[PDB]
Amino acid sequence: MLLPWLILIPFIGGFLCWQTERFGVKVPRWIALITMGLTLALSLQLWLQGGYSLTQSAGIPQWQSEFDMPWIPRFGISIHLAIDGLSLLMVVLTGLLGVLAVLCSWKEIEKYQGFFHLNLMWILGGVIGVFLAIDMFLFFFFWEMMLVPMYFLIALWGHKASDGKTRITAATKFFIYTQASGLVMLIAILALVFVHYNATGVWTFNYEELLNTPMSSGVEYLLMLGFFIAFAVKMPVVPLHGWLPDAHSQAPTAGSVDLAGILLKTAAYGLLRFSLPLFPNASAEFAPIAMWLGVIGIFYGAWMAFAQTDIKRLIAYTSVSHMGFVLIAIYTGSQLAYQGAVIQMIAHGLSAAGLFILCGQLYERIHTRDMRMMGGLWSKMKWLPALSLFFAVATLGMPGTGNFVGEFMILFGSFQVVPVITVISTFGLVFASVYSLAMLHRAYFGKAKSQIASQELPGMSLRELFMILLLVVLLVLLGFYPQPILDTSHSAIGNIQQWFVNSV
Amino acid sequence: MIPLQHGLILAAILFVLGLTGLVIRRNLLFMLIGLEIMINASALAFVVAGSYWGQTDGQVMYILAISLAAAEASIGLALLLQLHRRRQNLNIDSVSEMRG
Amino acid sequence: LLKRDPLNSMMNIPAVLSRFAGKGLLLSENGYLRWYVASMSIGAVVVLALLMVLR
Amino acid sequence: MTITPQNLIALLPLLIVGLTVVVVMLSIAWRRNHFLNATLSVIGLNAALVSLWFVGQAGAMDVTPLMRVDGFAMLYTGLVLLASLATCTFAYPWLEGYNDNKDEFYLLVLIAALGGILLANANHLASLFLGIELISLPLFGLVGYAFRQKRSLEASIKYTILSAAASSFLLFGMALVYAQSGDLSFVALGKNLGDGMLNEPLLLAGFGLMIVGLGFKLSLVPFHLWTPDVYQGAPAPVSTFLATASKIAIFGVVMRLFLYAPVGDSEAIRVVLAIIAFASIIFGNLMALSQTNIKRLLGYSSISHLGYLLVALIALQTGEMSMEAVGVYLAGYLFSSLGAFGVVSLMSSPYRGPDADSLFSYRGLFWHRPILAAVMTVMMLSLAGIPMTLGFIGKFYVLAVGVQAHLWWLVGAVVVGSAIGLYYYLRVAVSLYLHAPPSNWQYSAGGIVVLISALLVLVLGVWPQPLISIVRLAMPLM
Numbered sequence A: 001m002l003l004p005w006l007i008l009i010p011f012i013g014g015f016l017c018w019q020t021e022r023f024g025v026k027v028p029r030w031i032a033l034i035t036m037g038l039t040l041a042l043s044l045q046l047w048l049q050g051g052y053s054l055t056q057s058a059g060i061p062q063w064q065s066e067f068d069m070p071w072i073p074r075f076g077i078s079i080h081l082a083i084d085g086l087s088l089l090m091v092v093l094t095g096l097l098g099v100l101a102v103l104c105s106w107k108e109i110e111k112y113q114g115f116f117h118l119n120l121m122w123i124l125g126g127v128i129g130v131f132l133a134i135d136m137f138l139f140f141f142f143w144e145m146m147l148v149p150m151y152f153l154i155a156l157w158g159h160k161a162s163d164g165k166t167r168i169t170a171a172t173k174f175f176i177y178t179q180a181s182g183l184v185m186l187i188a189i190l191a192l193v194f195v196h197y198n199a200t201g202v203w204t205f206n207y208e209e210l211l212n213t214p215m216s217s218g219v220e221y222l223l224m225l226g227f228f229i230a231f232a233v234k235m236p237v238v239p240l241h242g243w244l245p246d247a248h249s250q251a252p253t254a255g256s257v258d259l260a261g262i263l264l265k266t267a268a269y270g271l272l273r274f275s276l277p278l279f280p281n282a283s284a285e286f287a288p289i290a291m292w293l294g295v296i297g298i299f300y301g302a303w304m305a306f307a308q309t310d311i312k313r314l315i316a317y318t319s320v321s322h323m324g325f326v327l328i329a330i331y332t333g334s335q336l337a338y339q340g341a342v343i344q345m346i347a348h349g350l351s352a353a354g355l356f357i358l359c360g361q362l363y364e365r366i367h368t369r370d371m372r373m374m375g376g377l378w379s380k381m382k383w384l385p386a387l388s389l390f391f392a393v394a395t396l397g398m399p400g401t402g403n404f405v406g407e408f409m410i411l412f413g414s415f416q417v418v419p420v421i422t423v424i425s426t427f428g429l430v431f432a433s434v435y436s437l438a439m440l441h442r443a444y445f446g447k448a449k450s451q452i453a454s455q456e457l458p459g460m461s462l463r464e465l466f467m468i469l470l471l472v473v474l475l476v477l478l479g480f481y482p483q484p485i486l487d488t489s490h491s492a493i494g495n496i497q498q499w500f501v502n503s504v
Numbered sequence B: 001m002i003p004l005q006h007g008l009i010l011a012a013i014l015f016v017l018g019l020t021g022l023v024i025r026r027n028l029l030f031m032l033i034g035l036e037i038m039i040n041a042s043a044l045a046f047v048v049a050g051s052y053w054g055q056t057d058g059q060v061m062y063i064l065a066i067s068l069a070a071a072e073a074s075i076g077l078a079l080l081l082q083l084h085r086r087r088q089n090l091n092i093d094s095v096s097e098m099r100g
Numbered sequence C: 001l002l003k004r005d006p007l008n009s010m011m012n013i014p015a016v017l018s019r020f021a022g023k024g025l026l027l028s029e030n031g032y033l034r035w036y037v038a039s040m041s042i043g044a045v046v047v048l049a050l051l052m053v054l055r
Numbered sequence D: 001m002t003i004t005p006q007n008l009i010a011l012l013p014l015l016i017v018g019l020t021v022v023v024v025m026l027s028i029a030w031r032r033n034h035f036l037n038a039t040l041s042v043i044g045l046n047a048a049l050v051s052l053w054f055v056g057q058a059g060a061m062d063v064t065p066l067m068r069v070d071g072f073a074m075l076y077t078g079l080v081l082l083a084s085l086a087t088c089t090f091a092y093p094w095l096e097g098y099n100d101n102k103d104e105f106y107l108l109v110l111i112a113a114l115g116g117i118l119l120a121n122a123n124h125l126a127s128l129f130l131g132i133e134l135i136s137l138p139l140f141g142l143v144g145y146a147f148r149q150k151r152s153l154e155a156s157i158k159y160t161i162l163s164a165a166a167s168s169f170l171l172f173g174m175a176l177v178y179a180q181s182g183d184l185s186f187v188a189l190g191k192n193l194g195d196g197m198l199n200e201p202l203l204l205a206g207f208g209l210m211i212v213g214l215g216f217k218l219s220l221v222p223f224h225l226w227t228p229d230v231y232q233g234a235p236a237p238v239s240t241f242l243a244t245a246s247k248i249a250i251f252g253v254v255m256r257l258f259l260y261a262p263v264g265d266s267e268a269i270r271v272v273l274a275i276i277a278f279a280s281i282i283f284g285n286l287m288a289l290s291q292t293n294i295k296r297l298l299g300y301s302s303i304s305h306l307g308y309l310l311v312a313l314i315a316l317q318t319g320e321m322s323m324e325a326v327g328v329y330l331a332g333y334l335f336s337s338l339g340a341f342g343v344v345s346l347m348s349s350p351y352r353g354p355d356a357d358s359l360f361s362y363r364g365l366f367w368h369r370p371i372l373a374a375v376m377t378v379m380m381l382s383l384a385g386i387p388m389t390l391g392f393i394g395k396f397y398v399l400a401v402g403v404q405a406h407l408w409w410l411v412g413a414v415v416v417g418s419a420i421g422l423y424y425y426l427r428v429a430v431s432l433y434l435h436a437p438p439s440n441w442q443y444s445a446g447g448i449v450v451l452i453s454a455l456l457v458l459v460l461g462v463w464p465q466p467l468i469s470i471v472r473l474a475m476p477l478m
């Protein structure tokens, strides 16, 4: 019922942001703020009225809310939305990060701010639609639809200090990676639909109907490979990862584009919701390759993050390492590891949002991102280095932050399933501490290594400090009291895990 | 008592001769001449096929073929005269300014 | 050793191959009409030879 | 077979366009008037477009031993008429700057549209040949309409020589096919063969030579090298017509020929067409990677899109939605090419003499022509097959048809070519918004046409069901 409005309020709000720029240059930011506040309020209302903590696992499908409308009846294609605990958590995180992205671009008084806000709102609506769609064609449609405003944002509103051609190159690489992988996913979807049609006679794209599809072993492996190639591009999984540091480097300086779609993790959700239930035997056969790719992703991302002289690229490779952890968790077939993966995705979203906002404000103060040109910035700034220290402490997995809860439940469940991959991943946590300490030492400690770092810098704004402290409070509360989040996603995770292990 | 294969072979020989003349000649006039040889060979092939089956369809296709040949000769010679007016040469290799 | 992201360059290899193949294929668009006719006859030979081979 | 009054009702757009040719000719003979003759041409084309309704209520019939009128022919007649009307609309502001006679442009456009209608209705080798040349020869005139311009004369000479060569190849192939079969109707090409002897060498050689001619006409590899030169050298409304109407009509008659001929089910012909489609997709996408000229880029784009269409054509005998995919893809490709070539034509109009270059310089177009820049970026996203655009719906149809028929090499070719196309289309679309250093109602009509094409592309990209239902309503004879 409210799910179409959860998708449509961002799109209508973006249209109103574009259109209401004639009334003033400071008007579209209020429209975007009202839009994302309304979307977040609707998501929280769905959380309160859903009763997710009392819901028990009854088997796939089990939706707390559902909407259906015919879209292309010739192919059996519907606007088909459904929400349960995992989808609801991802939608709430999307709404919160959208509010943060609106507030992070509050001071931009550019002549085309309305189109910027329209692109931001359309990216957020596409991400929410990805989390809500249980029609395969609609899921693919949102998956590819949220990449065009992101392309234009990176290419036209991006990092202004860099050349234009670097921004167009990064946006083009991101678009080609994501859309080619999406096309491979479309081929997998089409072949699954055709197998179901030849076995049943019904034109359907409904994920509930495609769950019970009789497939040969090898056909299922290829369909799983197409789905995994799309999700592995957008997770990222090595070696399909370099688009993410290039896109983070050339994103706009505020960081709203970083929070909008580059940081929300739809691929792990797609692996949990689609890859494991549709192809459980193929996923079980693919599990050693997937967890070894996760191990390689953890260590490669950590080593790449240590080798960066750019702080933004360091945070991007930090995301790569964390996603390697989540990818290991997804293929274990363990309830504890899946709940840890959910906590880890939410904690990564919050901590990377804090890191990217603080990096954007550091670049605002000092007009550079090379860590060799800064140093000793603890004595020069009022709030920024301490909050950066908190968020770097969070991303290495300190207890008291949600990252520890996530990665440690992941490692507990994984050790219950696969011990060697678990011990190698914990040494990956040692690597994580190494790169976080290296970033903190290179940026804020020591002596000033240039002239701009040796001067006093203006303090942060009250709104900027307010949302950074909101992220700090949310991360600490997730670290100390993760039980509401665990209870919200318990039934959906249980359904996915029971489907995965009861059909293998 | 003429084999159909012999008439088709004669038409094919004339067709490949016209195509060779179209390729090896730098002059636009000889290219148009080779084009006329090619279309006349194809029309002869249609006439041979129609005469084998005892049908008027071969001569009707011949009629359409020579209508096309006449109109194409008209247009090609107009373009050749325009080329000779605006360039004073019929070298087709010189008419190559659009490439890549 | 890894600071240049070798996996990124390994995945950038298809773009380099595509650029090289496009530059090589653009040599056929030299703008010469007689070569265009020759390529038409070459394609006719190739199509007919393929049809008699696979028949 | 004779002609009945019901057959005359099925003949209605052909008769109306021919009558328009005669009427516009006599009006030019009376007095040279650019506005009146352009108006008479567009009135005749609109009359044929609305006479398609009476054709539909006449029913599907066989009008000649040569023509067959059904929903298939109705759809391609409508597409050809839309392309011709748009060509006239773009042609008027361009011809406003033309110093020599302007009225003959519309006569040639009408005769080429007549050829497209004949190819839509063609059921015979004679009508297929005649429709191809009735399209081609007015295009010889139109491509070299500004023959004082050096590039237009070059394109005219190249197109005339190569199209005469392809016509000779096509006619020789038809003659070999007729020698084998004994009848020139589409359904009898291979009907005198049985017990698995469909691959007769003379029939296959004839169909190979016709494949050479038609693959020239469809810009298919390796008969594709003319396309960027003729697209660049021709006047921009002529480039619009040559990209849309000629390709659509020839592909429709090729669709009908391979549907009706029993030799269309041959394995060797299918493998040869698969090779041609694979090479066409890959080569056309690769060759547009480094193009700074929008016309040559759109020519290589035409090569790739015709490769995708040929992929849909290969699965015609196996799948059931192949011709429905062809119809949806051709509608989307027509509207996208109309928008792109129309923006090029509007920015190239009026014709500024033969001694001044007609270079586009699309960079920074948004800062002086924002609506045209929006239309052109919508067309660039549509030609890339990006969702929310009708080009994506066409690409989806092509991919579904390929997956249904297990044409996995062609499926991988479509994916790889789509990625390469993504690169260069996005390069053009983002170059529209960078920074770089009319006034009559006919120019506004051209802008309205490209804006309506952009709106149609977006609306049918998000809601393609009306177009799908219309295309499925256009069922040819089984």
Ligand SMILES: CCCCCCCCCCCCCCCCCC(=O)OC[C@H](COP(=O)(O)OCCN)OC(=O)CCCCCCCCCCCCCCCCC
Pocket (backbone or CB within 6 Å): A184, A187, A188, A191, A195, A198, A214, A215, A216, A219, A220, A222, A223, A225, A226, A229, D408, D411, D412, D413, D415, D416
């Ligand atoms: C360039 C990027 C894209 C990659 C290239 C494009 C895709 C290539 C796909 C290659 C597929 C090769 C299949 C080879 C065997 C075919 C014959 C066969 O075994 O057919 C079995 C079956 C038909 O018999 P049936 O009675 O229907 O049995 C149902 C079985 N489930 O057949 C079926 O039911 C249909 C089987 C379809 C199998 C899935 C095909 C698509 C899978 C996703 C994409 C490919 C894998 C991921 C990408 C690879 C690396 C790029």
Ligand SMILES: CCCCCCCCCCCCCCCCCC(=O)OC[C@H](COP(=O)(O)OCCN)OC(=O)CCCCCCCCCCCCCCCCC
Pocket (backbone or CB within 6 Å): A216, A217, A218, A219, A221, A222, A225, A228, A229, A232, A237, A238, A239, C014, C017, C018, D412, D416
């Ligand atoms: C311009 C040049 C550059 C650009 C172009 C570059 C090349 C593009 C194309 C690359 C892909 C080529 C095609 C790959 C798919 C091949 C499929 C295949 O061979 O299938 C055979 C068989 C089919 O299954 P079958 O055994 O028939 O099942 C019925 C009974 N069991 O299959 C099986 O039995 C299962 C086979 C599984 C393994 C084959 C697929 C490998 C995929 C490699 C990529 C993904 C690797 C894993 C993930 C990595 C991280 C994402």
Ligand SMILES: CCCCCCCCCCCCCCCCCC(=O)OC[C@H](COP(=O)(O)OCCN)OC(=O)CCCCCCCCCCCCCCCCC
Pocket (backbone or CB within 6 Å): A427, A430, A434, A437, A438, A439, A441, A442
């Ligand atoms: C002992 C027997 C049992 C084995 C237990 C496991 C091994 C225990 C090893 C203990 C000793 C580790 C010492 C690490 C010192 C790190 C601090 C240091 O020296 O920092 C210096 C340098 C500073 O870097 P930066 O921030 O860039 O500073 C700017 C200019 N200096 O910082 C650097 O250059 C970064 C240094 C990173 C060091 C990473 C160490 C990783 C350890 C992994 C252990 C794996 C164990 C298993 C191995 C395989 C077994 C089969």
Ligand SMILES: CCCCCCCCCCCCCCCCCC(=O)OC[C@H](COP(=O)(O)OCCN)OC(=O)CCCCCCCCCCCCCCCCC
Pocket (backbone or CB within 6 Å): D016, D019, D020, D023, D027, D033, D035, D036, D039, D040, D043, D044, D047
């Ligand atoms: C024999 C069998 C049947 C044949 C078909 C039916 C009869 C066809 C008759 C065709 C007549 C052609 C001559 C029309 C002369 C119009 C004169 C006129 O009013 O001109 C005004 C204007 C001139 O141009 P402008 O530059 O604007 O002038 C400024 C100076 N006042 O010009 C204008 O503003 C344009 C005025 C257009 C008027 C005609 C509109 C209707 C045309 C109908 C025929 C079109 C084709 C039909 C095809 C078959 C349909 C079933």
Ligand SMILES: CCCCCCCCCCCCCCCCCC(=O)OC[C@H](COP(=O)(O)OCCN)OC(=O)CCCCCCCCCCCCCCCCC
Pocket (backbone or CB within 6 Å): A169, A172, A173, A176, A177, A180, A181, A184, A229, A233, A240, C011, C012, C014, C015, C016, C018, C019, D289, D415, D416, D419, D420, D423
């Ligand atoms: C898991 C592996 C198996 C499954 C793979 C599934 C596909 C999706 C994941 C892999 C995607 C790899 C894409 C690699 C290229 C990314 C695009 C890129 O780098 O574009 C930027 C570049 C232009 O930038 P620049 O280098 O500055 O150019 C100078 C020219 N003046 O642009 C260029 O230089 C031109 C770009 C041309 C188009 C891109 C290349 C297309 C190649 C085929 C794509 C389909 C995938 C087939 C399999 C490939 C091998 C894995």
Ligand SMILES: CCCCCCCCCCCCCCCCCCCC
Pocket (backbone or CB within 6 Å): A089, A092, A093, A096, A346, A474, A475, A477, A478, A481, A482, A484, A485
């Ligand atoms: C999707 C966004 C998630 C943000 C982080 C939320 C972390 C959980 C916070 C729960 C509240 C903790 C503090 C209040 C405890 C109330 C105890 C109620 C039972 C007596």
Ligand SMILES: CCCCCCCCCCCCCCCCCCCC
Pocket (backbone or CB within 6 Å): A112, A115, A148, A156, A157, D374, D375, D377, D378, D381, D386, D387, D388, D389, D433
């Ligand atoms: C994917 C389908 C198409 C989506 C919309 C594509 C864009 C259409 C045109 C909308 C208006 C564009 C305005 C752009 C303004 C850019 C300003 C840049 C300033 C630096």
